[PDB]
Amino acid sequence: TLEGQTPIFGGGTGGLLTKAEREEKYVITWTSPKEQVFEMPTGGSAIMRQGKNKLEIARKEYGIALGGQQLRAKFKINDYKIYRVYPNGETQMIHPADGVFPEKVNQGRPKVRYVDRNIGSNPSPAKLKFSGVQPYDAP
Amino acid sequence: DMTQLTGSYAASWLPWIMIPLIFYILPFPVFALIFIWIEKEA
Amino acid sequence: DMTQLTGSYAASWLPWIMIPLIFYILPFPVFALIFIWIEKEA
Amino acid sequence: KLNYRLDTDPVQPYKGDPFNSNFSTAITDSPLARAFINNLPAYRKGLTPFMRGLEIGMAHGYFLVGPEVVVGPLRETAHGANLSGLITAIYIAVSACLGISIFAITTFQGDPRGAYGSTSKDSLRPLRNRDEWYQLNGGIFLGAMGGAVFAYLLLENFDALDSILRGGVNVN
Amino acid sequence: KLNYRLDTDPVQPYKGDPFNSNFSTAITDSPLARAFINNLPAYRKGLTPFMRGLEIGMAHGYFLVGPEVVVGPLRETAHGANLSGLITAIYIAVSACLGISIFAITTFQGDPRGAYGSTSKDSLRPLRNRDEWYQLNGGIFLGAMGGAVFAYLLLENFDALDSILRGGVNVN
Amino acid sequence: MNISDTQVFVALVVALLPGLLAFRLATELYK
Amino acid sequence: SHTVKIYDTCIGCTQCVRACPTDVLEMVPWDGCKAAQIASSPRTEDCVGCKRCETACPTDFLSIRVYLGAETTRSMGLAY
Ligand code: F6C
Ligand code: F6C
Ligand code: CLA
Ligand code: CLA
Ligand code: CLA
Ligand SMILES: CCCCCCCCCCCCCCCC(=O)OC[C@H](COP(=O)(O)OC[C@@H](O)CO)OC(=O)CCCCCCCCCCCCCCC
Ligand SMILES: CC1=C(/C=C/C(C)=C/C=C/C(C)=C/C=C/C=C(C)/C=C/C=C(C)/C=C/C2=C(C)CCCC2(C)C)C(C)(C)CCC1
Ligand SMILES: CC1=C(/C=C/C(C)=C/C=C/C(C)=C/C=C/C=C(C)/C=C/C=C(C)/C=C/C2=C(C)CCCC2(C)C)C(C)(C)CCC1
Ligand SMILES: CC1=C(/C=C/C(C)=C/C=C/C(C)=C/C=C/C=C(C)/C=C/C=C(C)/C=C/C2=C(C)CCCC2(C)C)C(C)(C)CCC1
Ligand SMILES: CC1=C(/C=C/C(C)=C/C=C/C(C)=C/C=C/C=C(C)/C=C/C=C(C)/C=C/C2=C(C)CCCC2(C)C)C(C)(C)CCC1
Ligand SMILES: CC1=C(/C=C/C(C)=C/C=C/C(C)=C/C=C/C=C(C)/C=C/C=C(C)/C=C/C2=C(C)CCCC2(C)C)C(C)(C)CCC1
Ligand SMILES: CC1=C(/C=C/C(C)=C\C=C\C(C)=C\C=C\C=C(C)\C=C\C=C(C)\C=C\C2=C(C)CCCC2(C)C)C(C)(C)CCC1
Ligand code: SF4
Ligand code: SF4
Ligand SMILES: [Ca+2]
Ligand SMILES: [Ca+2]
């Protein structure tokens, strides 16, 4: 379970919808040094509490925008985490994936979807006809 | 003519529609509403 | 007379029924068939 | 120094959840609005799906006859206008029932998508089973056909009913 | 030296069972035949028994009016011919619904005999419960009565419909 | 003197043959 | 989901990772550039295709490329 107190908010029209209860939902948790006003990702203003906060958001981009552009940039809060919550109740922490923010290089991270050539050396699509491989996926 | 109910006043169709509505159309639904009200479990 | 749709051609009753059939009788069932076809789960 | 003043707010979050995209207003949460909406045949507690459809069909089929009788293209004659209004109600209701049928066919495959899935909590869409939709549709069609005919019969006998409501039937 | 050549046979055993008294033919197992038959209201997947009866009755009551209107003993006058056709459809449908009722009464005692027993696997007779047969019967009667009356109304107003479908109602 | 009722009915029946063959081709192409 | 590929011309300026609004990208150790780091796309399932990363990329031509593919709920940016 995710712990924290929801920010003071009188209600809004940009909150969760059927997708939250049916497919997936996101939660962003952070700790603030004081009670202050922040902008909700989908409009309106909310008041983050003194201790640790928990906010439910419909999309992952809401958490990245709130944590990155407001918490880090404006409030100097660097401990925010984003969780993906499924209807069955399972919760996985997706940001930061390994506890280190992606913009900082961290050991043990593998190279994913790396092409060992310059982009101008991709093969022509005529060579890959009926093979099902895209030019950028070609070896 | 005096073989039917009529009205020389304005909108004489208003009694024509409202007498049935108040006296033998709506009263049974109103009684149903009151009966549901007075039978509700606590 | 020119107050109604008529036909001097053979079997002039055919447009009398075929126009309603193709244009406002069958199309909704046809759309229903296509809707079922394009929404079927894999 | 920050005072949201939520405790004295005339408009509260809906059902105490500030993040459900809804407000507690007079339309959505007042005692009269809740009593009226929740006791309509679509939401009335305990009603069987067929009984829900029957009452909805009766109400809708009855008034759908009217528009073509008064301003329709057969309005010049009483007999023709009534027939056109009855057919218009039948065509609309049958088309709607066909839509309700194919809605049930396509929605309820495996775990339904959206608001009709198993984990959905949409209180405004309580018919969560395929069987309930088909029972509702049967009630909708029969109610709409009956209500349309009831309006058709009253309009067809409007001359007699007008004498009825004025006491002209008491001459002899 | 024996070559049954079953692998290249255009007509195969039905459903892979050579000993079920059936063949895989264009009528029994072609994709179009299966799609049409299995989607008739008697077999359509997910339909409630009442909704099956409503569609079956609607179609049958509608066309049963016709035969007595055209070649019946009251065909000399339009008004009489329509009434005789409506009554004939009502009498036939009520007789059929009475037969359906007594079918359900006698078939479903204990473990039903024949194709409606618990261990029977008759894919062409899927209504295995007494409740399903009564729900079907209610839909059959109401659908047949509604379809017969719908045909009766169109035939009774045939002069109006004929002007309707020719634009003769647009003179005034 | 345009065609008669029988000719119209015959054409309707004849058109069934390309109608069924069009369905056969359409379903075969769908495979 | 969209496909995000990183080519060997990357200089490890971390600008694509900072520009991503859904955290698709991260910086991983590398040796092909002076910065000793290269961009990676482990979370392309969260990629919306905004191409903010390509705008941020300073190399010529782009060291990071986004190829729009099959659309999902999260790639369409749908809150419903
Ligand atoms: C466009 C538009 C349009 C149009 C056009 O213009 C129309 C028309 C029309 C016409 C035809 C008629 C009249 C005629 C006269 O005047 O004369 C007769 C009368 C009488 C006969 C009357 C008598 C009396 C009665 C019988 C009583 C009633 C009863 C009830 C139903 C019960 C109730 C129950 C519960 C309580 C509810 C009518 C009517 C109508 N309505 Mg119409 N509409 C429209 C609309 C609408 C809407 C929206 C809505 C809502 C939903 C609506 C409703 C309604 C109702 C309820 C109604 C009635 O009742 C009536 C009848 O049907 O009837 C029979 N619309 N419409
Ligand atoms: C002995 C034999 C015999 C006879 C005698 O001879 C008869 C007769 C007769 C006569 C009466 C009439 C015409 C008429 C005239 O011409 O004119 C009017 C028209 C109109 C009005 C028309 C109008 C238009 C409409 C309304 C439309 C349609 C609708 C639909 C129903 C819907 C559909 C839906 C889905 C898609 C299916 C009739 C009709 C008939 N049908 Mg008889 N029939 C017989 C048989 C049969 C069988 C088997 C079968 C298959 C079951 C059958 C079917 C049918 C159908 C569907 C029908 C249609 O509709 C019609 C009516 O009803 O109507 C109203 N039969 N049809
Ligand atoms: C208390 C006042 C009062 C009383 C006793 C009556 C009495 C009557 N009115 Mg009436 N009327 C009134 C005020 C009143 N009117 C007002 C203010 C209006 C204008 C909106 C009308 C408009 C009106 C029309 C259009 C018609 C009547 C008609 C009638 C007669 C049949 C009843 C009916 O159809 O009601 C119809 C009533 C209304 C359309 C609205 C009534 C509004 C009043 C203010 C409601 C009063 C509620 C009451 C005080 C609370 C009772 C509490 C309880 C404990 C007793 C009856 C003689 C009918 C008639 O003439 O038949 C021959 C008729 O067609 N009335
Ligand atoms: C492609 C050829 C073609 C076209 C465009 C039309 C067009 C028309 N016909 Mg027609 N007709 C055709 C061939 C065609 N006809 C043939 C071959 C026959 C003999 C069976 C008829 C028999 C016929 C009758 C009896 C009547 C019409 C009528 C009409 C009119 C209203 C539409 C209707 O009710 O269709 C009715 C159509 C049929 C009964 C059968 C049509 C059979 C054709 C071959 C189907 C062609 C399908 C097409 C090629 C596939 C489209 C693919 C798609 C991607 C576009 C309209 C002007 C009506 C009229 O005159 O109104 C005033 C009418 O009552 N047609
Ligand atoms: C010959 C077979 C046949 C017949 C007579 C009917 C008759 C009927 N169906 Mg139906 N239906 C059929 C096959 C048939 N169906 C099949 C195969 C399916 C599976 C897709 C359906 C699915 C279906 C649904 C989902 C619903 C109906 C409904 C209805 C009734 C209202 C009309 C309507 O909405 O049509 C809709 C018809 C279709 C969607 C498909 C019809 C396909 C057949 C082959 C049409 C044959 C017409 C033929 C070419 C021309 C004859 C008519 C003409 C001479 C006037 C009506 C009694 C409705 C009902 O019960 O009302 C309350 C309704 O909601 N039907
Ligand atoms: C007056 C005309 C009214 C409109 C035309 C009729 C519309 C519906 C007709 C087809 C319904 C059933 C579909 C096949 C029955 C069926 O279940 O087929 C099954 C067939 C194959 O499906 P799959 O490959 O997924 O395999 C599923 C298996 O069950 C069958 O192999 O898929 C189709 O839907 C067929 C191709 C699409 C449709 C092709 C075009 C439609 C016909 C075009 C030509 C019309 C000629 C008209 C002549 C009169
Ligand atoms: C009214 C009512 C209601 C509701 C209902 C519903 C929900 C309905 C639905 C309906 C529906 C759900 C419908 C549908 C429709 C459909 C359509 C309209 C379709 C169309 C299609 C088309 C047009 C196609 C096209 C195409 C394709 C896609 C492919 C191939 C080509 C073509 C062109 C063929 C309720 C219950 C509340 C109550 C009572 C009343
Ligand atoms: C919200 C509200 C309102 C409104 C209301 C409304 C909208 C109403 C409507 C109403 C209606 C719109 C109604 C209707 C009803 C109906 C009915 C009552 C029907 C009946 C029917 C019948 C009875 C039928 C029968 C049949 C059958 C079934 C079969 C055979 C044939 C016959 C015909 C017999 C108001 C503004 C006032 C006020 C405020 C609030
Ligand atoms: C149509 C229909 C159907 C159904 C059907 C059924 C299932 C039916 C049944 C029916 C039945 C189930 C019937 C029954 C009948 C019976 C009878 C007809 C009887 C008779 C009897 C007699 C004649 C008697 C005799 C005797 C004896 C035995 C002893 C003593 C002496 C004497 C002589 C009295 C279905 C569902 C498919 C679909 C829809 C339509
Ligand atoms: C297989 C096939 C076919 C055949 C088809 C058929 C056989 C058809 C029939 C059809 C029919 C035979 C149809 C019918 C239908 C019906 C209907 C659509 C009805 C409706 C009804 C109604 C709507 C009613 C209503 C009502 C009620 C319910 C109550 C009150 C009164 C009234 C009247 C309102 C052909 C050869 C072509 C081609 C090939 C394939
Ligand atoms: C006269 C008469 C009759 C009747 C008949 C009828 C009723 C007919 C009908 C007819 C019809 C009604 C026909 C139709 C046809 C159609 C067609 C011919 C179509 C075609 C199409 C096409 C060729 C195309 C196709 C395609 C493809 C291939 C693929 C994709 C899709 C589509 C569709 C585009 C009877 C025998 C009873 C009796 C004797 C007399
Ligand atoms: C109360 C309510 C509501 C509201 C509403 C409103 C505010 C409005 C509506 C409106 C509407 C919803 C309307 C409708 C309309 C319709 C129409 C306008 C139709 C028409 C039709 C016709 C005209 C037809 C014709 C025909 C015939 C008859 C036969 C064959 C041929 C033809 C096709 C020609 C809602 C939904 C929210 C919810 C529920 C309840
Ligand atoms: S396209 Fe947008 S979401 Fe996808 S990796 Fe680039 S910046 Fe991130
Ligand atoms: S913006 Fe371009 S150069 Fe900079 S780290 Fe990303 S891919 Fe490499
Ligand atoms: Ca009297
Ligand atoms: Ca007119």
- How does strand E12-13 pair with strand E23-24? antiparallel
Residue E141 and residue A44: Cα distance in Å, rounded?
A: 59
- Report the DSSP pairing between strands G37-40 and E23-24: unpaired
How far apart are the C-alpha atoms of E147 and E47, rounded to whole Å? 20
d(CA B27, CA B29): 6
Q: Backbone phi, then psi, for A16, in 5-degree steps?
A: -75, 155
Letter for the amino acid at E82? N
Largest CA distance in chain F: 47
Rounded Cα distance, D41 and C30, in Å: 31
Distances C1 to B32, C5, E160 between C-alpha atoms, Å: 59, 9, 18
Which of D50, D80, D134 shows the shortest C-beta gap to E160? D80
Task: List alpha helices for E39-170, DSSP H.
Answer: 49-64, 66-71, 78-107, 130-156, 158-164
Q: Which three-class secondary structure state does DSSP give residue B5?
A: coil
**Among G55, G65, G47, G64, which residue's Cα sits nearest to residue G11?**
G64
Report the distance separating Cα E172 and Cα D73, nearest Å: 8
Residues of G with CB under 8 A from a CB of A: 3-9, 12, 14, 17-18, 20-23, 25-30, 36-38, 40-44, 46, 48, 61-63, 65, 67, 73-74, 77-80
Residues 6+ apart with CB under 8 A from A64: A82, A95, G20, G21, G22, G23
Q: What single letter denotes the amino acid at residue A39? A: E
Cα–Cα distance between G72 and G70 in angstroms, integer? 7
CA–CA dist A77, E81 (Å, integer): 87
* SS3 category, B38: helix
Torsion of CA E70, E76, E79, E85, to 10 degrees: -30
The shortest CB-CB distance from D115 to any of A6, A18, A47 is to A18
For residue D165, give the ligand 1 atom closest to its CA. 23
Q: Which of D8, D19, D24, D120 to mutate to test the interface with A (most CBs of A within 10 A)?
A: D19
Measured in Å, residue G80 CA sits from the centre of ligand 7 at 21
- CB of D154 closer than 6 A to ligand 8? no
Contact F2, C10 (CB under 8 A): yes
The packing angle between helices D130-156 and E49-64, to 10°, is: 40
DSSP C3-42: SS----STTTHHHHHHHHIIIIISHHHHHHHHHHHHH---
Strands (E), chain A: 25-31, 36-39, 45-48, 52-57, 81-85, 91-95, 114-115
Cα distances from A65 to residues A41, A51, C40, G18, in angstroms, run 7, 21, 38, 11
H-run or E-run covering G6: strand G3-7
Would you state the structure tokens that stand for residue A14, as one six-digit string? 């940009």
Taking the C-alpha atoms of residue E151 and residue E170, their distance in angstroms, rounded to an integer, is 25
Alpha-helical regions (H) of chain A: 18-22, 60-65
* Beta carbons within 8 Å of G37's beta carbon, 6+ residues apart: A105, G12, G14, G27, G28, G29, G30
Q: Are strands A114-115 and A52-57 parallel, antiparallel or unpaired?
A: unpaired
DSSP state of A46: E
Give the list of residues 6+ apart from residue E52 with CB closer than 8 angstroms, or none: E41, E42, E44, E136, E139
Residue E13: helix, strand or coil by DSSP? strand
> Which residue is listed with tokens 């869409």?
D125
Enumerate residues lining ligand 13, CB below 6 A: G 2, 4, 19-22, 24-25, 47-53, 66
Does the bond joining G61 to the residue before it have cis omega, within 30 degrees of 0?
A: yes
Which residues neighbour E117 within 8 Å (Cβ) at sequence distance 6 or greater? E111
Kindly tell me the sign of the dihedral angle through the C-alpha atoms of A120, A121, A124, A129.
negative
Tokens linked to F16: 């069934």
- Which amino acid does the sequence have at A56? E
A122 DSSP 8-state letter: P
Distance CA A40, CA E20 (A): 68
Question: Residue C19 corresponds to which tokens in the numbers above?
Answer: 């126009």
By CB neighbour count within 10 A (0-12 exposed, 13-18 middle, 19+ buried), where does E106 fall?
A: exposed
Q: What span, in angstroms and rounded, lies between the C-alpha atoms of E143 and D145?
A: 11
Copy the structure tokens of residue G78.
């749908």
Contact yes or no for A108/A60 (Cβ under 8 A): no
Ligand 6 binding pocket (C-beta < 6 A) is C 26, 30, 33, 37; E 31-32, 35; F 19, 22-23, 26-27, 30-31
| CB distance E86 to E72 below 8 Å | no
E2 interfaces chain F, CB cutoff of 8 Å: no
Residue D154, CB-side half-sphere exposure with 13 Å CA sphere:
11
What lies within 8 Å, CB to CB, of F16 at 6+ separation is none
Other beta carbons within 10 angstroms of residue D111's beta carbon come to: 12
Q: Which of A35, A96, A86 is nearest to G17 (CA)?
A: A96
CA–CA distance, E20 with E170 (Å, rounded to integer): 62
Identify whether the C-beta of residue B4 lies closer than 8 Å to the C-beta of residue D166.
Answer: yes
Count helices and strands in chain A by DSSP H and E runs: 2, 7
Q: Which residues pair with G4 in a beta bridge?
A: G66
User: CB–CB of D57/D139 below 8 Å?
Assistant: yes
N-term to C-term CA, chain G: 18
Cα separation of G11 and E12, whole Å? 67
In 3D space, the residue among E93, E98, E109, E105 whose CA is nearest the CA of residue E144 turns out to be E93
Q: State the Cα–Cα distance between residues A14 and E172, nearest whole angstrom.
A: 54
Helix (H, G, I), strand (E, B) or coil at E126: coil
D54/D44 Cα distance (integer angstroms): 13
How many Å apart are CA G10 and CA G33, to the nearest integer? Answer: 7
Question: What's the gap in Å between the CA of E162 and the closest CA on chain D?
Answer: 12
Q: How far apart are CA E161 and CA F8, in angstroms?
A: 25
**Alpha carbon distance D93, D65 (integer Å):** 11
- Return the residue matching tokens 């906060």: A53
Query: Quick one: resolution in A?
Result: 2.0
Short-list D159, D126, D155, CA closest to D62: D155
Joined together, the tokens standing for residue A94 give 């997706």
Distance CA E54, CA E62 (A): 12
Give A82's strand partners.
A28, A95
Q: Which residue in C has a C-alpha nearest to residue F2's C-alpha?
A: C9
DSSP code per residue over A86-106? -TTS-EEEEESTTSS-TTS--
If DSSP codes are grouped into helix, strand and coil, which group holds residue E67? helix
Nearest Cα residue to A30 out of A77, A100, A89: A77
> Is A22 strand, coil or helix?
helix
Cβ atoms of residues E38 and E124 within 8 Å: no
Look up residue D139 and give its amino acid: G
Q: Cα–Cα distance between G33 and G8 in angstroms, integer?
A: 9
Q: Is B16 on the interface with D (CB under 8 A)?
A: yes
Residue F3 CA to its chain's centroid (Å): 18
Helix (H) or strand (E) holding F14: helix F5-30
The pair of three-digit structure tokens given for residue E72, joined into one six-digit string: 């019946």
**A60: how many CB neighbours lie within 10 A of its CB?**
25
Phi and psi dihedrals of E161, rounded to 5? -65, -40
Strand A114-115 to G3-7 pairing: parallel
How far apart CA D19 and CA A15 sit, in angstroms, is 5
CA distance D5 to D22: 19
Q: Which amino acid is at D135?
A: Q
Secondary structure of chain D as H, E, C letters:
CCCCCHHHCCCEEHHHCCCCCCEECHHHHCHHHHHHHHCCCCCCCCCCHHHHHHHHHHHHHHHHCHHHHHHCCCCCCHHHHHHHHHHHHHHHHHHHHHHHHHHHHHHCCCCCCHHHCCCCCCCCCCCCCHHHHHHHHHHHHHHHHHHHHHHHHHHHCHHHHHHHHHCHHHCC
- Where is B34: in which H helix or E strand? helix B27-39
Kindly write down the DSSP assignment for every residue of G32-62, as one continuous string. SSTTSEEEE-TTGGG-----HHHHH--SSS-
Q: Supply D72's token pair.
A: 């329709």
* Element holding G17 (H helix, E strand): helix G15-19
- Residue A36 pairs with which residues in a beta bridge? A48
Two structure tokens written together for B36: 């549901």
Residue C5, min C-alpha distance to chain E (Å): 5
Would you say G4 and G43 are in contact if contact means Cβ atoms under 8 Å apart? no
Looking at residue E20, the DSSP 8-state letter turns out to be S
Look up residue A128 and give its DSSP letter: G
Say how far apart CA G23 and CA G15 lie, in whole Å: 12
Q: Report phi then psi at A85, rounded to 5.
A: -115, 125
